[PDB]
Every structure is written in structure tokens, then in C-alpha cells.
Symmetry: D3
Subunit: 307 residues, 6 copies
């Protein structure tokens, strides 16, 4: 009904309905699973889809797989080509969200994987952008602590990490908030439940540094480049404290799926300059012109699909 015509699985583009499996097949594998979120952005005027920083996502997926210790099976170039092929084959001409997901198949046990082989699918579906809309969310700080390198490295884009995200997002929802921010075990600001967080204070952009215990977000990376290069902003990656964020002029989440999400308040402290505030607005607009292929300066970040 509302399923794509195809997916990619284990080196092959296949009709959706051929990837039928048993209920009991993938539960143990899910504990090993790592994934990527990738957007294809549809430029109607050009009649072209641009995949955003596809190679960087493919590379991070390879790194995640490596950190899980999955044997080599899929190259970066194969992941990139498979993605292009799948988006083309699906023949949906609109904004999409693409999820490669890799998993090890080994022991029918959760505790220990043993002898394993590596498998992977890529799943592409329509997904709206909101880059043309001005909106914002109310955030709280969670009473649950972010995973850290001691227990579950946040660098690894593992499915299991999201159980931690879920503790926080479920608490935000029952406590009257749209979204939750995490503190790390040391009590410093880490990231959102599915994205990284930026603060604007006195004309400066401030974001937790990578060793704060966060995923090395590609949207985050993009934003830092755009802030420095297009807007000439000072950007500090540093340790960030909870109460300083209460006083931010502006704040936003960023991630592939969430794009640039302005934050109106944090623990009910309202960002002084609104949401999206002036600087967030500029970053959001620049980002949108980049990802839709309307900004020649950042062409190398885009992979045209050819449809």
C-alpha cells in the first residue's frame, strides 16, 4: 500500500515483497545493528534529487560497523552506488529519508555474537522537509544520563543507543515538553535524543565538543562550516554547562532527519531572541539552499541521482 517499490539488501536491489522473513530472524541481530540517516532532497526545477553528504554517511557507517567488529563485506563505494540505484529505482521524485542498516548474523544469543557474517539493507521512503517553515520546540533537560564511552560509545550509531534516547524522550513527553536534552555523567551538556544541540549567545555559536559524549553529527559538522565560512561567526566547540544554556539568545537541534530544529525554551527558560532567532534563521536558510542544490559553493557535498 504505502511501501516503496524496492529496497537494497545484501548487494541487490529487490522488489519490496521479496524481503519476507521470519518473525524470529532478526531480534538477536538487532543488538549488533548500526545505521545511518541520509536525506535525498528533490529540486523540482532541475528535476533532480541530491543526496546530502552521502560518502560521509557511508564512511561513518563503515566506521560504526568496524567498531561493532563486523567482518568487511560492503565497501563505501558500494554503499554510495546502492543508495543512488535504490533512489532511482524507487522513482519517487520528492524529499526522501534513506536508512542503511548493517547487522551481524551469528549466535542466536544477545550476550555474545561469536562467528558472524555481515549483512545490510538500505530502505528509502518519502519524508517531508520543514526547511521552508518557521517553527520551534520546547526542550527539557532529562533526569536520565547520556550514555558515555565507558559503557556504550555514543560515536557508534548503534540501534541500542536509542534505548537511552527513549528514556529521555518518553520523560519529555509525559512532562509536557516536545523534546529532551541530555547531560553526560559529569553533568555537562551532551546532545538531544536524536540530534546535536547549538546555542547562540552574544553573537557567538557554542556547541558541546565531540568528547562531551555525542554522535559526531554530520549536520553539526555542516553547520560549523556554514557558520564560519558563510556567516563569519565565531564557533566554539567546548564543554557546555546547563545553566548557561538557560541564558542562550537562541538554540537549535540539528540532525539529518530533524534538519535545523529551533528551540523556543529550555526547562521553560525562553530563548531571548526567539526561535528561529536571527542567527538560526540565517543558518537554516543557508542549509536549505545548500541541500536543495541551489548553492554552488557546497556542490561537493551533494550526490545527484540522475532522474
Amino acid at each position: 500500500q504505502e511501501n516503496p517499490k524496492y529496497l537494497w539488501w545484501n548487494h541487490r536491489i529487490i522488489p519490496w515483497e521479496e524481503a519476507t522473513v521470519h518473525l524470529t530472524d532478526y531480534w538477536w541481530a538487532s543488538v549488533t545493528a548500526v545505521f545511518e540517516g541520509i536525506r535525498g532532497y528533490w529540486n523540482n526545477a532541475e528535476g533532480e534529487m541530491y543526496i546530502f553528504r552521502l560518502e560521509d554517511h557511508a564512511r561513518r557507517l563503515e566506521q560504526s560497523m568496524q567498531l561493532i567488529r563486523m567482518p568487511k563485506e560492503f565497501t563505501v563505494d558500494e554503499i554510495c552506488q546502492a543508495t543512488i540505484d535504490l533512489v532511482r529505482a524507487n522513482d519517487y521524485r520528492g524529499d526522501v529519508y534513506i536508512m542503511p542498516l548493517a547487522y551481524a548474523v551469528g549466535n542466536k544469543a544477545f550476550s555474545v555474537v561469536g562467528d558472524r557474517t555481515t549483512e545490510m539493507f538500505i530502505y528509502s521512503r518519502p519524508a517531508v522537509s520543514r526547511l521552508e517553515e518557521d517553527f520551534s520546540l520546547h526542550a527539557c533537560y532529562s533526569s536520565w544520563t547520556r550514555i558515555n564511552e565507558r559503557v556504550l560509545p555514543p560515536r557508534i550509531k548503534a540501534l541500542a543507543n536509542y534505548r537511552n534516547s527513549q528514556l529521555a524522550s518518553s520523560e519529555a513527553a509525559m512532562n509536557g515538553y516536545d523534546t529532551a536534552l541530555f547531560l553526560n555523567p559529569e553533568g555537562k551538556v551532551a546532545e538531544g535524543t536524536g540530534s546535536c544541540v547549538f546555542f547562540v549567545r552574544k553573537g557567538k555559536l557554542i556547541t558541546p565538543d565531540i568528547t562531551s559524549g555525542i554522535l559526531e553529527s554530520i549536520t553539526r559538522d555542516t553547520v560549523i562550516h556554514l557558520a564560519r565560512e558563510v556567516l563569519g561567526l565565531e564557533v566554539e566547540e567546548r564543554v557546555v554547562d546547563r545553566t548557561e544554556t538557560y541564558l542562550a539568545d537562541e538554540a537549535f537541534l540539528c540532525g539529518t532527519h530533524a534538519e535545523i530544529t529551533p528551540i523556543a525554551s529550555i526547562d521553560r527558560h525562553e530563548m531571548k531572541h526567539g526561535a528561529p532567532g536571527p542567527i538560526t534563521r540565517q543558518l537554516r536558510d543557508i542549509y536549505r539552499e545548500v541541500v536543495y542544490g541551489r548553492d554552488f559553493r557546497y556542490r561537493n557535498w551533494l550526490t545527484p541521482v540522475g532522474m
Copy 2:
């Protein structure tokens, strides 16, 4: 090949009918919780006994509650479904039974919100080693056990096993059979799929539950057996790493692992062997209990009526 049946969402179904799409359950797996339950086949009686079925069903309900899955399955239904399934499968041998509950809602990891609760029960043959004398060499992992700050170990969640996997994968590449965890404070927690006991000078010593461990039912059984049958002094307390190096004996216990003797820890050999005298007594008593040959603990057994 495969069992004849599964139980799924209130009904016993033929194995072959439980087909699904490859992409169906990856997000759900982040919410998933499970139980391990053994059925033990007593050939002389021609009967299967399920060990502490109601205790497992209750812990499953607690896990689901702690995930905030809406009510859907009662403890009594879980118990009856399990009995029905083991009988229907008509396999006359040691089995391992896995009830596994999951919430279905958003095809997103970061947040589920208004979702429904689903569950299958999967019973498969699984050998016992209770008649074999064997032992494993353990290391302490360089990875830290999850704690209540980040991922409560009380909840039998699939996601927790990503942490188990860091440690067990390190044990395997470093020449050990099995890994033990320290908690963030540096105290002894549990094994990657089981709890741990130490014997020193006639006394049984095991990390207390607030050490950051699952409230193991085999652990609970062992404490009852040690106190009531053998009159051993049993301490649940904070346990230090180096004291375990000097244990006379040590063992893992868990539903799947049964009673697993440990020969050495970080290459320090338990001086009374593995299984040492006390482990041997406990292993034998446990075996006579679970196979239904010890009337003192019959209340822990659910006969399936395979006759």
C-alpha cells in the same frame, strides 16, 4: 529444523505463518524486553518442567512496565501461553523459551508515542550441561557495566546486550571464555549474560542487586539452595575486584548458563578447582531441583503435561 509453533499476540500459530517484512521490527527492537525460561525434560517421568515460570512472567511484566508498554498481556496469559506452546511443539527434551515483548508505533528510534504492545514466545531445543563437569576462564572487561543513570540493568532489555557484547567480544579476542563487569564505581557487577558468585572460606559472596545487575532468578534460587539445603552463609554485598582473584571457587549462574564454574579470573586460578566442592554441591542440587527429582522445591516447577 524449526519448532512446529510459536505463540504470537494471544494465539498459537504454525511456525511457517509468522512471516514479516525485513524492515518491520528494527525500531521496535529498541523497546524490546525478553525473558529466558528453561523447560527441563525428565525422561523417567516423561514430563517437562518449566522452571520458575510465574517468577519469569512477573519479571517480564515488570520489564514491560518499566519500558511503559500499555497493558495487553497478563502474567496468567504469559504462563498459560508458555505451557500451551511447549505442549503443542511436542518436543520431548530440554528447551529454552524466550518470551519477547516490544512496542509498535513510530518507525523512529528516538521516540515512540502512543504505541501498542506485542509479544511472541519462542521455544527451541537447548541442551543442559548439568551432567558435565566443565569450567571457563573469565576476564574483567575494560568496558564498564551500564548503570541506573544511563540504562537500568534491572530491565531485561535487548539494548542492554550491546553493552554485554562489548565485554564478551573483548574476552573472545583476548583468549578468555567469558567476561565479568565492573560497575562505574569500579565494583564487581555481573557477567555478560549471568550473575556471578564467589566462594571464600566456606562463605558464598555475590554482588548485591544495587551493584547494578539484573535480579537473576537463578541467583535467587542459588541463595535459597545454599542457605536452606547446605546451610552456607551467603552475603549479598558490594564486592571488590581483587578479592575475587582470591576466591576459592567462583561460578556464573543464569537461566541459559545454568551453573557455570569459573576456573580462573584474569588468569588467577580459583584454588579449589572448578567446579570446586561447594560449586559441585550447588550444581548437583540445582540439577535435581530443575529436573523434578527434589520434592523440597517442587513448587518452583510447572509440569507441562507432555504425557
Copy 3:
């Protein structure tokens, strides 16, 4: 409006004469320690009973010692001053009595040098809810409880309540009646103004004192009553957050809060209600004790002679 008297620096003084300058006590407040004590009015007897007066006076002495206030007011004086004040005020009803001690020293916050010790006792009408069945919804705070490293919770210092205020303010704006704290290690400590108990499978469980909590006198009372009157097993131990989500019942206790049932924690509902069976028994036993109708514990009571 106001009580007829208070007690201040060794003397009962008419309310209106205890006037001071705006700038007198701000620095002093950083050193200040206090107690909460209830007087319970038994109408049938026409008598007021002060609950565990001497124990509170002793804890006040300990707090003052831990602040290093020079000796000035003995336990005996605190007890007598309290009795005298409640009698002089001639209010025949449930009261809440607050002795508050402070060092007078440097007009600086950072440091006091040589200091003298001062104290007032302030008694005011305060209703009991021990005849009412009610309960609160609690959350765990995202703010951490003070610990011995930074601000020993053993000391009943005013400054500690700035930490309480972070949590109770968050509970209020997030839709809850009351907040529970985790300590820095992530274990269950206490409420913002009281200690917490959980009932599970017929057993009473409460964070041990080294969890980083005040040594509550209501807590101590409850442990005695649970063991002695109901024959319950009571465990003082490390308590984990998720185990409390599964408690059959839960309650706060403290002098002001009395026995306050908890209906839910982080929206996990206590399965046996609020007050559940065991809480109800403890609340009722406590009420019969403090109003002087249980002679087994009469030695905890100081009759005022009203």
C-alpha cells in the same frame, strides 16, 4: 495573625518587640541551622504534646556544632524554652515550632571569623492531616542531591534548601506535587523536605543514612513503629531508582509532612494505592502516638501543661 510571643537569645519576647534592621541577618542566614518540631493538641485531654523534643534539641546542638557555633544554649535550655513559648503563646491547637540558630560575625558571606551564637524559637499554628486520606504524585528530579563532598545533608542548614528548591521548583512546573532526589552516584536519597519509604512484598525499604540524607526523626520513629507494632521487616540500604517504580506503596515522612502517601513516581502508580494497607497502618499508629493516645510510646512526648 501572629503568635503573642517568640523566644530569642534566652528570653520570651512579645511578638511586636522583635524588630530588627533590614540588613541584620543576610550574612547570618548562610550559617543558619534549624529544626522542625510539632506540638500536637489533644482536645479531649486539653493538653499539647511536643514530639521527640529532646531528640530535636540534640540534633540542633549537633548541627550547630557542625557549623562550629560556640556553646551558648544547652539542650536543656532549648527544651525548656520551647515548652515555655508554647505555653506563653496559649494557642490550643496543633503547632509547628522552628528553633533557628545562627552565628553573628563578619558582615561577609565568604568567611566568618570569631563569632557569637544566637537563636530564636518561633511557634505557629499548623494543621495536621493525620485524619485525612490523601496522596501526592512524585517525580525524580534532574537536579542531584547535595552530598558530604560539598554540603553534608546531615547538617540541617538553611543553605541546603537552595538545592531542595531546584528540585521542588522543577516538580511544580512539570506537573508533579513533589520531587525525590538521586545522590551523585545515581541512588535514591530523600525528598526535598522529608525522607522516603517504599513498601514491597510486605517489607519496608528506605535509603540508608549514608545515601546522603538528613537523619530524620520521623524516619527513626517509623522504623521503630514498623518493627515493634507491626512486626515488619525494615531494610535500610542502597535503593535504586527503578525498584521504586515497582513499589507496592510509598510515602514521605518528616516532622512537617507527617506521613505523606505517594500515589505515583514518574507516573508509575504504586500498585496497592496511597495510602496503601501498610502506609495506612503506619499513619494511624503514628497519629495515635503523637496525640498521646498510645501509652507504649508516651516517653516520646513532652506534655506542655496547657
Copy 4:
């Protein structure tokens, strides 16, 4: 004895009329936040200059916001009130000015509900030591500095000083003039009432703000002066305890403390003395600034019109 006036809740009031009841402000004190601001009297000019008045008024606004006090007094009002008070007091000498804001709410410590915001400003004579060469011996405290988990040090709250008091009281009884804090992770934070700087090999080093310190305005001033006037490299970073034992020079800075040289830390003597060469230069530059004799930084000064 006493200033002729203070400012309170929108009005200048004669000193003697600001009388209150003993029991009025104890609960309020737990919510209280304050600022320290100096007025420096330039005798030659016959003028008082208030140092970075607007920055202090803004930090006070921030503290009040972090306590969640409803808006009542704007930055502009705080600045004008300060000017008016110093003028009205007509004291022609170095002063120390303390605005103190507090919420008036529940007569309880644990929790305030709906509250209103109040504030007084209290100006008093206070000597400068910027013309004197002196130094202090410091120890590291065995008590740990508050952190964002429990009591954010960013908030200039009275309650924070209970933590300061643990350390300064220990320094005093153990033979030292002043105490430095480690944060919970064991890194150098700040003094009990000021920030700390170290000089090593011609470089200035100071704990970064996320070390768990107040965002000191004297600290900010010093960083500007070191970089702009002396062309020194200044590093804000994590600082370790033992590296400070090897500093060539060290000093405290804060509004009240001004620039206070440190002779030794845990009896390790700063090798270049106290004030060492660089501290001496910074102290002198700071003095010329605050007394209005350095026109490069005149925008930091508010002339009172005395």
C-alpha cells in the same frame, strides 16, 4: 556608624526606617542572590566611579532569572538606584555596594510557590588595598566546590557561601589566610569568594568557566588588561592542582578582594614572589583603571556626580 540611606523596593529610605520583623527573611534568604560592586573615590577629581555597574546589574538579572524571580526591577533601574543611593549617602570615599534580590513567598524552605520579587541595595565604606603590597598563604580545601549537578556556581546565590564557609573555616583553623577549591573531578575551580590566576613562564592561566566557577567580572577585566595592555598570552582551560604548586606567581581576583597576590599554595611558595612582576603590573593597571586615571577603559566606569 551607618549609611544615611539604603534603597529598597523602588525607593531610597532613611537607614533607621528599614526596620522589619525578626522572622521576616529567613526563608527568603534561601532564594537570595546578590552582587558586589565597588565605587572608587578619586580624591583629585572629587568624583566616585562605579566599576562595571551595568555588567553587575545584568549578572544580577541573570541570577534572579535562574532563581525564577518574576520581573520587577530592570537593569536600568538597578543602575540608577545604585547611582542615586551612592549620591544620597554623600560618603566621599571607596565604597562596596551590595544589591540583594529575594523572592517573597511560602514561609517554608523546601519549596516556594507563587512569589514576588524584592530587592535592596546597601552601600557602605570599604577600603581599597590597591596601593598596598601584601599577599596571602592559600591552601587547597578538603571540601569540594559545588557544581552544576547540585548548586550551579554561575548563580551568585547566598546559599553557595555555605560551601565557601566549609573551606574558609578549614583554612583559618589550619593556619592559612585563604582556601582554594577543587571541583568534584579534582580540577582547580576558584577561591571561596574570588577567582584565581596563575603566572607561569610569562603566561597567565586561569580555570575556564565550565570548571565550576562564578563568571567573575574582575576575572573578565583582568583577561582584557593582560591581553590588551601587557600583550600577555592568557589561557582559560582545565587547571591541575600540582601545576599551581609550580606557578611563578598567583593571585585571587574579585570585586571585594580586588587583586590579591598569593605567596604560597599548600606551603609551596610562588617563586617570583607576591606580588610578582606580572601581578604587580596587573594590580597597578587595574588601580589606574578603577580610579578613572586610565582613559582607555573609561567606558567601564560610571561617574556618580558627587
Copy 5:
């Protein structure tokens, strides 16, 4: 001049002057070194020396050596006999303090030992007892933190541990105190710089439990036995807080060398019942009658030397 006639070294009693070595011989070995402190107590009336809990000390030394991973070389019985032989040979008839010290000889490097053999000497010298004197010390809590199992297990009686002790004792001395007490990394009471600590409050004896991060003191063990068995005191081994110790009725250090050392104050808070307070006094007296061989109930703790 003032040196014993003999020591024991590597299986042999030797004249003192034969154990000459090069300045550069033992510096790397010292990093590996572990030791024991043992008292011989001279009962003049009997003309006998009694060594206190010699076998327990020998066993702990073997454990320390094991935890350092020194190859087996010296048995418990040899250590005990060597000690007896040496005390006899030295022919000093008075209170002595005996230090066995074991070390690995391997790499001329500190970082890493490599291939190693195990060596050991025993060094016995006159040492006064003060068990007939009433005296006390003023203690402070150190600003330096006690070593823990994460970094340097306090269970192991290693020379290196005392560098940590030295930070605290040096600070006590320069700050006007006799002696320092430690907090562990979690901020809880651990032990003294060379002994364990006990508090008396409301007729009860309270001491940090072993997993507080302390050496498992044999004097501590003795005291707990004596308090329970002779005095019928309630003794709690538990987590202990700093401020509760400020309010103790009494307090004391105990260790082999320090015997029972009363503490008059802690951070200048004076113990309410003096030093030695009533209970400390009773324990000190009972201890003295035991170690000098005047209490038949505890004869098994004593090894008579035969002189």
C-alpha cells in the same frame, strides 16, 4: 652498631653484614614490592616471645605476592618458620617489629617487569609497645583522596601505596595535626595513612567496611572479634560518612605497628568521651592481655618462639 645480628634472605638466615648489595640493585624491584608488619611481644615472666597472628600475616603476604603476579617461591610455612628462626637467632628478648618484604627481580625498568623471579627478606628489629600508656592523637581529613581498586587496590600491601599515604601524612604534619584520615573517591571514610579507623557512637562500634577501599587489617579483624566476643558490643562494618565521625564519642586507629591509637579529635572536633574513651580503653586492655600471651581464650593467635 644498632643493627640486628641477623636477617633472613632467600631461604637463609645470614649475618647482617653479608646482605651487602649495590646502590643500583633494588630501585626497579621496589615498585613491585609488597610487605607485612608483624609484632613479636616479649612476656618477661614467661621468658617467651609471642608472634601475633603470624600465619595470617604470612598468608596475606602470599596473597599480596600473588596479586603482584610473583612466581611461587616461598610457602606460608616457610615464612612462618623463617620468622621464628630469625627472632630466635637475633636473641633480642623484647618487643620487636618484623617486616617480611617480597619483590620481583626482572627488567631493569619500572613500567614493565617481564620475566621475573621472586625474592624475599625478613627484617626484625626492637620496637617499643605503648599498650601500657594512655595517649591520643589529633587527626585531620586529608585533601588527598585514598587510592581505590580502579587504580591501585588498597587490599595489596604494596610499598607503592604509601606514596599516597605520604601525601596525606605530610599534609597533616604541615597543617598542625598528628595524623591524617582518608576519604575514598566517593567521599566516604576509608582508613588512616598506615592503619584502619574505628568510631564509637552511642555504645556501638562502627568501622568502614572492607570495600570502602582499605587494607584488610589484621588488627582491625582482631578488634572486631574482641569487641563482639569479649565486650558483647554491636559492631557495624558499613559505609561511614565524614560528618558522623565528627560526632563520635570515641575514635581510634589500629594497625600492627600502631597497635590501638586513640584519637582525641578529628578536624578539631573533640571526641566527647575522651581518648582513650571507656570503650577504646577496654579494647586496648583486652588486646594487650591477648598479644602478651596472658589471655588463654585467644592462644591460637600466638606463635611462641622458644627462647
Copy 6:
């Protein structure tokens, strides 16, 4: 066999004269601090160069100060003594020189109080491997590095190596050449006898000094060489464990270890080899510097006058 001389307490003495008693220095070793210094023999010039002698002498003085040893030896004396000794020994080859200072006072570990300061300097042949291409396999230890709370890593104290030994002994029994430490917060600190560098995408990354590491002089050298000769971007910062798994190259550096390439970490292979391109450049530049063949860094060298 042995060098002809040592330096001890202000004088050069014949090796054979520095005899002592077995029992003399065990307590002193707890206070002891040392330096490692290399002399490099340039055969073409027939000269020995001491590398950064004054920097080492200064760090020795700082260590001694931090131990609170009374003043006794000046930096200038240490430097001259070293030169004198290397010359007197008349060995024409690569040497490793160890000045080692210790306080002598009480024959007790727990406390020294009013003691005197002593020092020897010990120069011995030691091969360089700067002309060999080799690499080591590293693991992260399950033991935590000492920190400023317990045992400041800044101080080059013998006692700190007990902590090194836990990790290096674990590496050896677990099949690795060398161990890396995490600090108590779980961040990358240093090797057991050296500092560590990572190369990722052209950038050199090394833990900052407040990570809890010795302020390595080889580390300092490397940062100067990388920036000034090669124009590499060098970050001193907090470093995470899993980021190091993905380093293109990695190496240890220390006086004794020189520049030691790391082939893999926890069996993750550095993808550019060992020595990788950048390590190779740094190793070669370092070699040309220390042997006196690079005039740009001549100021770091002290010629001994062996000619």
C-alpha cells in the same frame, strides 16, 4: 659488565664503592622520583649528545619539590654531574641516564618527617631503535590511570609505576606488546611508560596534560617538530577511546621508547600502517635531531666532549 662510575651525593665514585645494605632503601623508594635521559652517540663526529638535559634536570627538581624534598642539588649541578659521569664512564655509544632522588629519614613508609635529600645518577648502555622499522600492538587496560586526586601523574615518582605495572602485566598476559590507559573519567591518558599520539586525516591529536599524564619531553619535542618542520596541525585536547580505534596512525613517545609506532589498538589496525607516512616523517626527523644532524634543533643537545 657494569659502568666504571656512578654519581652519588655530589661526587663521581667508582662503581664498586657504592655498596649498601639490602635493607637501606625500601622506605626511601616510596619517596623516590627519577628522570630518563638519553645520550646519543654520533659516530661520524665521535661525540655524545645529551637530549634536552636542562629540561630533564628542571623536571627532576620539580618532582623533588612536589615530594617536598629539602633543597640539596641545583639544576646546574645535575646537568654538570650528568656530563661528568657520561665522560668519565668513557662509553662511546647510545646510553640511557637515570638521575634518581630520594628522601632519607624514618625507617617508615607511612610518614617521613625532617629527612635529607639524596641522589645518584646512573648511566648505562641502551640501544636506539631509530634506524629500525617496527611497531607494537596495544590494548586499552582494564586498570585506570592514577589521577591528581590520588597520585599526581605530573610527578615522575617510582610509586606511579605500580599503576603502570598493573596495565603492562595485563597486556603481556593478554597477548599485547603494550597497554594504553583511560583516566577515571574514561578518557585517553597515556601509555605505561610514554605518551601517545594519534594521526587522523593529516592531523596529530594527543591527550592534553590535564588528561592526567606526565608532561613528556619527547611529547613536547614531537609537537614542536610536527608544527615547525612539517606544518602539521596538532591538537592537545580530551581524546576518546573509540576515536583512537579509527586513527590512521598512532605512536608512543618517551625518552626510553623514542618514537614507537602502534600497529593496532584492541586489534583495530591503524589503516595507514606503522610507522605510517606521518609517523615515519616524525621518527626520521627526531632521529636526525637527537644524533646532532639537524642544526635547526641544536639548542636541545648537550655535547659531552667525549673527543
